[PDB]
mmCIF file of C-alpha atoms in Angstrom:
data_model
loop_
_atom_site.group_PDB
_atom_site.id
_atom_site.type_symbol
_atom_site.label_atom_id
_atom_site.label_comp_id
_atom_site.label_asym_id
_atom_site.label_seq_id
_atom_site.Cartn_x
_atom_site.Cartn_y
_atom_site.Cartn_z
ATOM 1 C CA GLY A 237 26.854 14.639 24.628
ATOM 2 C CA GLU A 238 26.702 17.752 22.644
ATOM 3 C CA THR A 239 27.120 18.664 18.861
ATOM 4 C CA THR A 240 27.755 22.338 19.134
ATOM 5 C CA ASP A 241 30.191 23.976 17.252
ATOM 6 C CA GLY A 242 32.625 26.343 19.229
ATOM 7 C CA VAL A 243 35.796 26.763 21.418
ATOM 8 C CA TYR A 244 35.715 24.657 24.497
ATOM 9 C CA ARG A 245 37.622 24.529 27.976
ATOM 10 C CA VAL A 246 39.157 21.411 29.005
ATOM 11 C CA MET A 247 38.676 21.045 32.568
ATOM 12 C CA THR A 248 39.554 18.441 35.455
ATOM 13 C CA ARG A 249 37.091 18.135 38.237
ATOM 14 C CA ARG A 250 39.107 15.496 40.028
ATOM 15 C CA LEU A 251 42.683 16.844 40.152
ATOM 16 C CA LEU A 252 43.526 19.761 42.029
ATOM 17 C CA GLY A 253 40.177 21.336 41.811
ATOM 18 C CA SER A 254 38.239 21.752 38.716
ATOM 19 C CA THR A 255 41.744 23.513 37.231
ATOM 20 C CA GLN A 256 41.957 23.783 33.378
ATOM 21 C CA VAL A 257 44.440 21.643 31.593
ATOM 22 C CA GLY A 258 43.636 22.954 27.985
ATOM 23 C CA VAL A 259 41.677 24.074 25.292
ATOM 24 C CA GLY A 260 39.475 22.606 22.364
ATOM 25 C CA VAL A 261 37.672 23.099 19.067
ATOM 26 C CA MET A 262 34.581 21.449 18.165
ATOM 27 C CA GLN A 263 33.330 21.327 14.736
ATOM 28 C CA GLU A 264 31.381 18.742 12.499
ATOM 29 C CA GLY A 265 30.872 16.328 15.603
ATOM 30 C CA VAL A 266 34.311 16.218 16.292
ATOM 31 C CA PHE A 267 36.507 17.736 19.196
ATOM 32 C CA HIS A 268 40.513 18.705 18.469
ATOM 33 C CA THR A 269 42.798 19.218 21.147
ATOM 34 C CA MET A 270 47.041 19.052 21.607
ATOM 35 C CA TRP A 271 47.909 15.683 22.679
ATOM 36 C CA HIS A 272 49.586 16.421 26.056
ATOM 37 C CA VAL A 273 46.561 17.839 27.193
ATOM 38 C CA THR A 274 44.575 14.937 27.306
ATOM 39 C CA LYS A 275 47.175 12.172 26.678
ATOM 40 C CA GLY A 276 44.827 10.746 24.366
ATOM 41 C CA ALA A 277 42.354 9.576 27.244
ATOM 42 C CA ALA A 278 38.840 9.646 26.758
ATOM 43 C CA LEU A 279 36.732 12.804 27.836
ATOM 44 C CA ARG A 280 33.157 13.637 29.167
ATOM 45 C CA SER A 281 30.552 15.926 27.531
ATOM 46 C CA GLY A 282 28.459 15.640 30.951
ATOM 47 C CA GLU A 283 26.485 12.567 29.585
ATOM 48 C CA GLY A 284 28.451 11.621 26.493
ATOM 49 C CA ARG A 285 31.962 9.843 27.148
ATOM 50 C CA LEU A 286 34.044 11.416 24.102
ATOM 51 C CA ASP A 287 36.824 8.597 23.034
ATOM 52 C CA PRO A 288 39.767 9.304 20.763
ATOM 53 C CA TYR A 289 39.830 8.733 17.222
ATOM 54 C CA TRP A 290 43.343 9.857 16.320
ATOM 55 C CA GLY A 291 46.283 10.803 17.924
ATOM 56 C CA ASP A 292 49.834 11.549 16.993
ATOM 57 C CA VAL A 293 52.502 12.332 19.930
ATOM 58 C CA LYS A 294 54.868 13.740 17.382
ATOM 59 C CA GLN A 295 52.057 15.883 15.869
ATOM 60 C CA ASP A 296 51.106 16.254 19.341
ATOM 61 C CA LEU A 297 47.567 16.155 18.182
ATOM 62 C CA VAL A 298 44.504 14.457 19.048
ATOM 63 C CA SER A 299 40.587 13.983 17.835
ATOM 64 C CA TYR A 300 37.731 12.809 19.284
ATOM 65 C CA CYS A 301 34.265 11.103 17.954
ATOM 66 C CA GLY A 302 35.959 11.435 14.358
ATOM 67 C CA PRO A 303 38.981 12.167 12.189
ATOM 68 C CA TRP A 304 40.693 15.564 12.170
ATOM 69 C CA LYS A 305 38.792 17.946 10.142
ATOM 70 C CA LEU A 306 40.706 20.875 10.601
ATOM 71 C CA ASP A 307 42.897 21.458 7.401
ATOM 72 C CA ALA A 308 43.018 25.413 6.831
ATOM 73 C CA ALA A 309 46.368 26.813 6.966
ATOM 74 C CA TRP A 310 48.223 30.162 7.492
ATOM 75 C CA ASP A 311 48.882 31.628 4.101
ATOM 76 C CA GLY A 312 52.520 32.725 5.157
ATOM 77 C CA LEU A 313 51.374 36.294 4.631
ATOM 78 C CA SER A 314 47.910 37.648 6.788
ATOM 79 C CA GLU A 315 47.889 38.515 9.893
ATOM 80 C CA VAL A 316 46.267 36.055 12.280
ATOM 81 C CA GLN A 317 44.280 35.743 15.523
ATOM 82 C CA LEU A 318 44.521 33.225 18.618
ATOM 83 C CA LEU A 319 41.216 32.879 20.088
ATOM 84 C CA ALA A 320 42.997 32.579 23.265
ATOM 85 C CA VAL A 321 40.925 30.783 26.489
ATOM 86 C CA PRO A 322 43.177 31.480 29.574
ATOM 87 C CA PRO A 323 42.254 29.390 32.725
ATOM 88 C CA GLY A 324 39.458 31.086 34.750
ATOM 89 C CA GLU A 325 39.169 34.327 32.219
ATOM 90 C CA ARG A 326 36.737 35.055 29.378
ATOM 91 C CA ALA A 327 37.619 34.078 25.736
ATOM 92 C CA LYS A 328 39.324 36.979 23.589
ATOM 93 C CA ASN A 329 40.865 37.211 19.982
ATOM 94 C CA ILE A 330 44.497 38.352 19.765
ATOM 95 C CA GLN A 331 45.595 39.456 16.347
ATOM 96 C CA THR A 332 49.245 39.095 15.337
ATOM 97 C CA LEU A 333 51.570 38.276 12.253
ATOM 98 C CA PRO A 334 53.173 34.664 13.057
ATOM 99 C CA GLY A 335 56.710 34.308 12.980
ATOM 100 C CA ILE A 336 58.234 31.553 11.440
ATOM 101 C CA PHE A 337 59.807 27.940 13.111
ATOM 102 C CA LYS A 338 62.451 26.706 10.890
ATOM 103 C CA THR A 339 63.310 22.727 10.826
ATOM 104 C CA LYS A 340 64.928 20.549 8.475
ATOM 105 C CA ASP A 341 61.186 19.600 7.066
ATOM 106 C CA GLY A 342 60.624 22.996 5.857
ATOM 107 C CA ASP A 343 58.843 26.292 7.774
ATOM 108 C CA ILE A 344 55.944 26.426 9.956
ATOM 109 C CA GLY A 345 54.024 29.547 11.443
ATOM 110 C CA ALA A 346 55.137 30.485 14.868
ATOM 111 C CA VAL A 347 53.076 33.273 17.143
ATOM 112 C CA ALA A 348 54.951 35.014 19.824
ATOM 113 C CA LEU A 349 51.778 34.662 21.921
ATOM 114 C CA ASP A 350 52.636 34.059 25.700
ATOM 115 C CA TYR A 351 49.856 32.726 27.558
ATOM 116 C CA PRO A 352 49.307 30.462 30.903
ATOM 117 C CA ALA A 353 49.503 26.656 30.352
ATOM 118 C CA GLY A 354 46.038 25.484 30.307
ATOM 119 C CA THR A 355 45.613 27.420 26.870
ATOM 120 C CA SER A 356 46.960 24.879 24.861
ATOM 121 C CA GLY A 357 44.387 23.963 22.441
ATOM 122 C CA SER A 358 43.318 27.377 21.900
ATOM 123 C CA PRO A 359 42.406 27.649 18.135
ATOM 124 C CA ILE A 360 44.302 30.589 15.702
ATOM 125 C CA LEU A 361 42.247 31.663 12.920
ATOM 126 C CA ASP A 362 42.317 33.411 9.846
ATOM 127 C CA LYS A 363 40.197 36.275 8.208
ATOM 128 C CA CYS A 364 37.626 33.970 7.397
ATOM 129 C CA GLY A 365 37.082 32.481 10.772
ATOM 130 C CA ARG A 366 38.732 29.410 9.848
ATOM 131 C CA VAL A 367 41.043 27.252 12.216
ATOM 132 C CA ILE A 368 44.187 27.152 10.878
ATOM 133 C CA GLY A 369 46.235 25.297 13.971
ATOM 134 C CA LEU A 370 46.176 25.230 17.877
ATOM 135 C CA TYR A 371 48.083 27.019 20.440
ATOM 136 C CA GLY A 372 50.593 25.277 22.842
ATOM 137 C CA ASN A 373 53.344 23.740 21.667
ATOM 138 C CA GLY A 374 56.143 25.468 20.974
ATOM 139 C CA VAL A 375 59.675 27.171 22.608
ATOM 140 C CA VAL A 376 60.596 29.584 25.134
ATOM 141 C CA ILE A 377 63.367 32.457 24.284
ATOM 142 C CA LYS A 378 66.026 33.750 26.263
ATOM 143 C CA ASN A 379 63.715 36.782 27.391
ATOM 144 C CA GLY A 380 61.558 33.833 29.013
ATOM 145 C CA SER A 381 58.933 34.677 26.410
ATOM 146 C CA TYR A 382 56.962 32.088 24.678
ATOM 147 C CA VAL A 383 56.674 31.240 20.790
ATOM 148 C CA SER A 384 54.080 28.582 19.839
ATOM 149 C CA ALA A 385 54.083 26.600 16.634
ATOM 150 C CA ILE A 386 50.854 27.050 14.645
ATOM 151 C CA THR A 387 50.272 22.828 15.068
ATOM 152 C CA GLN A 388 47.786 21.663 12.010
ATOM 153 C CA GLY A 389 46.923 18.266 11.484
ATOM 154 C CA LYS A 390 45.772 16.440 7.915
ATOM 155 C CA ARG A 391 42.428 15.850 6.677
ATOM 156 C CA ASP B 276 38.631 11.310 33.470
ATOM 157 C CA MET B 277 38.339 14.861 32.307
ATOM 158 C CA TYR B 278 35.670 16.710 30.641
ATOM 159 C CA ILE B 279 34.606 19.834 28.400
ATOM 160 C CA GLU B 280 32.887 23.149 28.928
ATOM 161 C CA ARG B 281 31.962 25.591 26.009
ATOM 162 C CA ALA B 282 34.026 28.646 26.080
ATOM 163 C CA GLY B 283 32.389 30.376 23.033
ATOM 164 C CA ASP B 284 31.826 30.697 19.435
ATOM 165 C CA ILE B 285 35.044 30.458 17.136
ATOM 166 C CA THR B 286 34.720 33.722 15.371
ATOM 167 C CA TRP B 287 37.264 36.457 13.687
ATOM 168 C CA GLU B 288 36.626 39.640 15.760
ATOM 169 C CA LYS B 289 36.461 42.874 13.926
ATOM 170 C CA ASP B 290 38.951 45.174 15.862
ATOM 171 C CA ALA B 291 41.143 42.856 18.096
ATOM 172 C CA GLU B 292 44.400 44.117 19.756
ATOM 173 C CA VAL B 293 47.273 43.406 17.510
ATOM 174 C CA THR B 294 50.231 42.053 19.439
ATOM 175 C CA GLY B 295 53.469 39.490 19.221
ATOM 176 C CA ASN B 296 56.489 39.606 17.476
ATOM 177 C CA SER B 297 56.876 37.680 14.257
ATOM 178 C CA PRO B 298 60.389 36.038 14.752
ATOM 179 C CA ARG B 299 62.214 33.444 12.515
ATOM 180 C CA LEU B 300 63.591 30.634 14.653
ATOM 181 C CA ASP B 301 65.649 27.645 13.900
ATOM 182 C CA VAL B 302 64.389 24.950 16.016
ATOM 183 C CA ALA B 303 64.129 21.140 16.005
ATOM 184 C CA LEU B 304 61.297 18.686 16.799
ATOM 185 C CA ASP B 305 62.360 15.396 18.527
ATOM 186 C CA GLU B 306 60.572 12.088 18.493
ATOM 187 C CA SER B 307 58.644 13.188 21.624
ATOM 188 C CA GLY B 308 56.881 15.899 19.803
ATOM 189 C CA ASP B 309 58.852 18.744 21.667
ATOM 190 C CA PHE B 310 60.414 21.639 19.876
ATOM 191 C CA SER B 311 63.693 22.871 20.757
ATOM 192 C CA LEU B 312 65.945 26.053 19.816
ATOM 193 C CA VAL B 313 69.036 24.870 17.652
#
């Protein structure tokens, strides 16, 4: 068990070696990631078993040890930063101006940043360092390129 | 079973590289949480 805020790798020791399935945000004692990463399964902190608190397959979001605590949102104006944490690579910030996912229920921010599978759950930041969403759920365009939504839950 | 390991502090880096387009895309979110191009 650990209390340290920060970005975390979600690894898998047993399956296909210690591989990376995704990334996650630890804040205020609560761990946040994308649902398809853990499938709402309990996780290990080395000494502490972290259990899912809230989940949503539709939003592709799950939280551990507490409710979803991230509520910062993209201002539809500023440039953001994907704190990308790719498998077997050091974390790095990637600045960009979000595109737009246009749905029937309104519009949400989308980032045209292409990173390998296992990067899902990587935080997207505003210029105050606040997490305005997670990376890893989106679409593939004709290019073969990748566009992810800025997936954010309610608090 | 899975586990977690720290990857660093969450912070906005001063002069980070600027990339990516800003595309406007008509998409649909099905019940399974999957996005799809309209």
